[PDB]
C-alpha cells in the first residue's frame, strides 16, 4: 500500500517507571542503618508508604526487616538509633 | 464513542481526525448548505463558543443569513409559535460551528 500508514509497535517515547529508592537492592534486618532511615527519630514509628515513597513490596520488606531487627536485638524499638540520625533524610516528613 | 469511525488514530494520547472522511463529509455538508441557500432557505448558525461568537455573527451578517451564538433560551425552536408568533418561519437549516 503506502509506507506512510502508521505501523503497529509499542511506545518508544515511554519513560521508565519511577523506581523506588530501594528497588533492586537487598533489604536485610542486619542493616540497622537502612531500617532506621525509615523510622521516626522521636517515636520509632514505622513510616507509611505515603511518607517513605516506597512501593508495596519494598514497604513490606522494610516493615518485616524492622520487626525482625527489633525483636532480635539489632534495632531500638521506641526510638531511632542516635548514631543514625545523621543519615540522609529520605522520608517526606517535616516536624518543624 | 460515536466519533470512533471518523478518528484516523491516536498520536501520543491525542486523537487525530481522519481528513479523508472529513473531506467527503465536508463536501456533502457544503453541497447541502449551498442547495438550501439556493432554495432561499433560512440558515441559522449556532455556536456557544464565546471566543468565536463575534466572528460567527459577522459571517452570518455578511452572508445574508442568521446567527444565534448567545444563550439559547428554552424553547426557541419547539415553542417558536409562542415566543415569536404563530406565523413565524423556522430555519430551514441549522449549522453548528460548535455542537
Amino acid at each position: 500500500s503506502n509506507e506512510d500508514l502508521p505501523i503497529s509497535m509499542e511506545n518508544p517515547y515511554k519513560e521508565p517507571l519511577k523506581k523506588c529508592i530501594l528497588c533492586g537492592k537487598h533489604v536485610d534486618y542486619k542493616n540497622v542503618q537502612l531500617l532506621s532511615q525509615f523510622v521516626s527519630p522521636f517515636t520509632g514509628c514505622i513510616y507509611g508508604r505515603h511518607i517513605t515513597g516506597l512501593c508495596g513490596k519494598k514497604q513490606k520488606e522494610i516493615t518485616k526487616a524492622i520487626k525482625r531487627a527489633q525483636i532480635m536485638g539489632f534495632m531500638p524499638v521506641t526510638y531511632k538509633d542516635p548514631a543514625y540520625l545523621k543519615d540522609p533524610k529520605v522520608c517526606n516528613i517535616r516536624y518543624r | 464513542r460515536f466519533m470512533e469511525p471518523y478518528i484516523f488514530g491516536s498520536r501520543l494520547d491525542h486523537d487525530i481526525i481522519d481528513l479523508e472522511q472529513t473531506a467527503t463529509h465536508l463536501q456533502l455538508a457544503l453541497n447541502f448548505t449551498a442547495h438550501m441557500a439556493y432554495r432561499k432557505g433560512i440558515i441559522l448558525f449556532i455556536s456557544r463558543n464565546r471566543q468565536f461568537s463575534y466572528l460567527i455573527e459577522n459571517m452570518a451578517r455578511d452572508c445574508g443569513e442568521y446567527a444565534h451564538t448567545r444563550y439559547f433560551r428554552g424553547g426557541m425552536l419547539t415553542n417558536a409559535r409562542l415566543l415569536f408568533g404563530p406565523t413565524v418561519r423556522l430555519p430551514d437549516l441549522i449549522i453548528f460551528l460548535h455542537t
Binding site: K19, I21, L22, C23, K25, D28, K30, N31, V32, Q33, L34, Q37, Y84, D87, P88, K89, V90 | -
Partner: protein
C-alpha cells in the same frame, strides 16, 4: 556451574580441623552490614 562453585566454596568452610583458627580470625575481623540510601537511590557506605 552451581555445583562447581559449591566445590570451590566448601574449601573455605569451617571444620573441626580449622575451628580455632577460623574462630580467632573472626574475632579479630569485623563485618559491617550497615549502609544508607540517598534520595537519588545511591548507596552510601560507612567509614571504618
Amino acid at each position: 556451574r552451581e555445583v562447581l562453585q559449591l566445590q570451590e566454596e566448601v574449601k573455605n568452610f569451617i571444620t573441626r580441623e580449622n575451628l580455632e583458627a577460623r574462630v580467632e580470625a573472626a574475632l579479630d575481623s569485623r563485618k559491617n552490614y550497615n549502609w544508607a540510601i540517598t534520595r537519588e537511590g545511591l548507596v552510601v557506605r560507612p567509614q571504618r
